Design a protein around this ligand. Structure first.
Ligand code: GLC
Ligand code: CA
Length: 771
């Protein structure tokens, strides 16, 4: 490996061999189907709300999130980079697709598949990833750096449906070598959203944009229709000329054939025919190819940038609504702008690289933090783009001030912005994209007094319940299968209108968002204040025994939605205390004296009673009335965690919090698989895992990272990182279960998972305490 020195891959990048098999992979062990797309994954490409494309460590473009809210895992075999190399004065060269695999059927059988093992590496540090190619039959070594411009405090480039592939080629031998790199792409118009004749009308064109000291050559893959529909738009691939390289192309090859129309050209001398052909297809799949060819002398290096863009302006949800995607603000709405996007990328990618470096540097340059922690911190951010992210720039055929936003909780449970989950999962948004975070919370504010008296069947017990109750915060802002932002509470396993955490978590989120953006956004507090008061006031009415605390009802009436709580619970009770303290503080900021006084009185009564009811000398009991009420819950003091973040001080005595955290570390972590897998949710005082519900026996990745944050705030540094380490290990390490770029909600002690691609573990950003 002589190429790694010519490029700048951080030591904290996650790494795996190209073509590596992983032996220990976890699966769901479940009655009903659950997504399991395998361990062959990678860092995604594409901006927020743009639709994303998962290119795997084996090189395939395989995890398609282009249809907003859907996860479709299938390798589009025509989409590849390929290489040709010929040592000068040899009869023949060699051509190889850079993909560690082959097609299942006979399409593209002429191409050279099965990039060999032990011949290159994949590296990831989101939003960047890299491949190196160090192959005994390829004298010139190659690497590519690929990324999209995901940039904190930037709401423009961060939205773009674009990727850059910056190639480096180095000749370590003592012979001249002729080299070509070729990007192939299928015209994917009709891949989704088209009900009949999926390729019909697709056509490809070539754009050559020449100007002083500049040339871009691109293929634009579109359709002859000017229909404004979800399925229609354009893909583009292209390259920018650099000194010493020539460009060749082929406008049209048939993807539903053997591929030799393209491959006989590339494999001969790495130079394509430069044949333009705009003839539209009918049934056959078609694709385009862009290539560069160059001669490398001994010791010579060259760099050449390619790019990919996709202008699919309209997202459609299953309930029928059609919306424009955010990037359309910058490029237009007509779906004929893929070349403009691609050109912006090829003319600005060096600046984008620097902007990414600028935001990663503070963490990377902190040598007190272990590299493993940095691996998880950056790579967990994949989900912000990959989580079905919807970011609208108008309803099709209709203009407001704001752009509504939603991130899915996951794909198995297809709900936008699940509030009980975003309490944990929204840290990257508040810390890095706060204008989005505030928009999401105003969306929740707007829902507080919505009433929907229509009834739905509750999944857990089969009873009927009212959809949305006035004054209760919704569980979620709808589903991609229905009407995001319009029809809320898509979730139906339990009735969220009687949840005891959502209203308090909402208040805590509001105050968090004020505190973590500088304590200056009075307008945001003013916008949300009425909803904050309503939320706490409604929750107060759920106090059935007048101890000043809402009562859990002997059912799963909170985020642990199969784990029953009864009476006063540590979890909902601490959250309530913290939420009252936040509301007092907002009252003071807004000069609402009556509110300050009311919530101060409620707080003092509830705090006193919480302590008496639950403090047992070592930790806080799970609750007052359940069968295993003395279980040690990992999340028992979630309220005090948020209070630390919000700078609200002690809601419980310092000494008692410290003892509780130490007990959680000693038991839920260190007595669960030797502390190598995170914090199990429920442990019995005898040191045996609580078996009363599956959730008690699960580690929740996002709960565990949040707990690590709490420990870190409380000066338990070693316990904090050891607790987080088991999550990193399980996700990323060779000894783990192969969950990279699909971090799940949960695993059990055998390592098998629930709900891959989950929002909650974004909570790792709560560990950026100093920030
Ligand atoms: O795994 C538990 C979780 O399952 C689903 O994501 C529910 O929508 C969520 O509310 C709950 O916390
Ligand atoms: Ca009560």
């Amino acid at each position: 490996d002589k190429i790694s020195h010519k490029i700048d891959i951080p030591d904290s990048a996650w790494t795996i061999g190209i073509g590596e098999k992983f032996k220990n992979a976890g699966h769901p062990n479940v009655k009903y189907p659950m997504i399991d797309d395998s361990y062959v994954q990678g860092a995604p490409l594409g901006g927020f709300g743009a639709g994303t494309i998962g290119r795997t460590y084996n090189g395939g473009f395989s995890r398609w999130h282009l249809e907003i809210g859907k996860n479709k895992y299938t390798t589009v075999y025509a989409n590849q980079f390929s290489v040709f190399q010929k040592v000068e004065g040899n009869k023949d060269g060699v051509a190889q697709v850079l993909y560690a695999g082959e097609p299942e059927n006979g399409y593209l059988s002429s191409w050279k598949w099965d990039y060999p093992k032990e011949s290159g590496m994949y590296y990831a540090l989101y939003p960047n990833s890299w491949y190196t190619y160090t192959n005994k039959d390829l004298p010139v070594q190659l690497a590519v750096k690929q990324f999209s411009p995901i940039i904190p405090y930037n709401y423009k480039e961060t939205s773009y449906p674009v990727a850059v592939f910056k190639w480096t080629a180095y000749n370590p031998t003592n012979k001249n070598v002729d080299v070509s790199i070729m990007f192939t792409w299928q015209n994917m118009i009709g891949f989704f959203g088209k009900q009949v004749n999926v390729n019909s009308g697709n056509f490809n064109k070539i754009i050559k944009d020449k100007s002083k000291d500049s040339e871009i050559v691109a293929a634009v893959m579109g359709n002859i229709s000017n229909d404004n529909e979800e399925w229609n738009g354009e893909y583009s691939i292209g390259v920018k000329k650099v000194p010493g390289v020539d460009i060749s192309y082929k406008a049209k090859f048939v993807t539903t054939g053997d591929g030799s129309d393209l491959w006989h050209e590339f494999s001969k001398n790495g130079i394509l025919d430069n044949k333009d052909d705009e003839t539209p297809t009918k049934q056959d799949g078609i694709g385009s190819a862009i290539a560069v060819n160059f001669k490398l002398q001994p010791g010579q290096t060259i760099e050449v940038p390619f790019a990919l863009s996709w202008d699919l302006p309209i997202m459609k949800f299953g309930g029928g609504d059609k919306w424009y995607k955010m990037y359309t603000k910058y490029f237009g709405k007509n779906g004929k702008n893929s070349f403009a996007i691609l050109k912006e990328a090829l003319n600005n990618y060096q600046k984008w690289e620097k902007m990414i470096d600028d935001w990663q540097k503070p963490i990377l340059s902190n040598k007190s933090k272990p590299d493993w922690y940095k691996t998880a911190l950056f790579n967990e951010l994949y989900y912000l783009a990959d989580g079905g992210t919807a970011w609208e720039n108008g309803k099709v055929g209709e203009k407001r001030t704001n752009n509504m936003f939603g991130l899915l909780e996951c794909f198995d449970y297809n709900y936008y912005e699940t509030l009980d989950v975003r309490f944990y999962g929204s840290f990257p948004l508040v810390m890095l994209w706060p204008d989005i975070e505030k928009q999401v919370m105003r969306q929740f504010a707007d829902t507080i007094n919505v009433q929907d008296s229509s009834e739905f069947k509750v999944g857990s017990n089969g009873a009927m319940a009212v959809k949305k109750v006035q004054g209760m915060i919704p569980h979620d802002l709808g589903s991609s299968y229905a009407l995001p932002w319009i029809k809320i509470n898509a979730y139906d396993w339990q009735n969220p209108n009687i949840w005891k955490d959502l209203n308090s978590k909402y208040v805590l989120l509001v105050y968090r968002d004020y505190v973590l953006t500088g304590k200056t956004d009075k307008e945001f507090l003013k916008y949300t204040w009425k909803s904050v008061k309503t939320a706490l006031d409604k929750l107060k009415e759920m106090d059935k025994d007048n101890d000043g605390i809402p009562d859990n009802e002997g059912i799963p009436d909170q985020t642990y939605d199969t784990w029953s709580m009864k009476g006063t619970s540590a979890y909902c009770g601490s959250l309530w205390l913290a939420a009252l303290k936040a509301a007092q503080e907002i009252g003071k900021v807004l000069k609402d004296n009556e509110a300050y006084i009311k919530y101060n009185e409620w707080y003092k009564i509830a705090q006193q009673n919480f302590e008496k009811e639950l403090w047992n000398g070592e930790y806080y009991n799970f609750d007052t009335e359940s069968d295993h009420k003395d279980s040690i819950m990992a999340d028992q003091l979630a309220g005090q965690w948020y209070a630390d973040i919000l700078r609200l001080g002690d809601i419980l005595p310092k000494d008692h919090v410290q003892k509780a955290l130490k007990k959680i570390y000693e038991f839920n972590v260190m007595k669960f698989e030797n502390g190598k897998m995170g914090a199990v949710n429920g442990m019995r005082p005898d040191g045996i895992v609580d078996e009363s519900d599956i959730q008690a026996q699960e580690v929740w990745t996002g709960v565990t990272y949040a707990l690590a944050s709490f420990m870190k705030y409380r000066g338990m540094t070693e316990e904090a990182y050891n607790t987080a380490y088991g999550v990193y290990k399980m996700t990323y390490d060779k000894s783990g279960k192969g969950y990279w770029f699909r971090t799940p909600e949960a695993w059990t002690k055998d390592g098998n998972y629930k709900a891959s691609m989950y929002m909650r573990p974004l909570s790792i950003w709560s560990m950026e305490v100093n920030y």
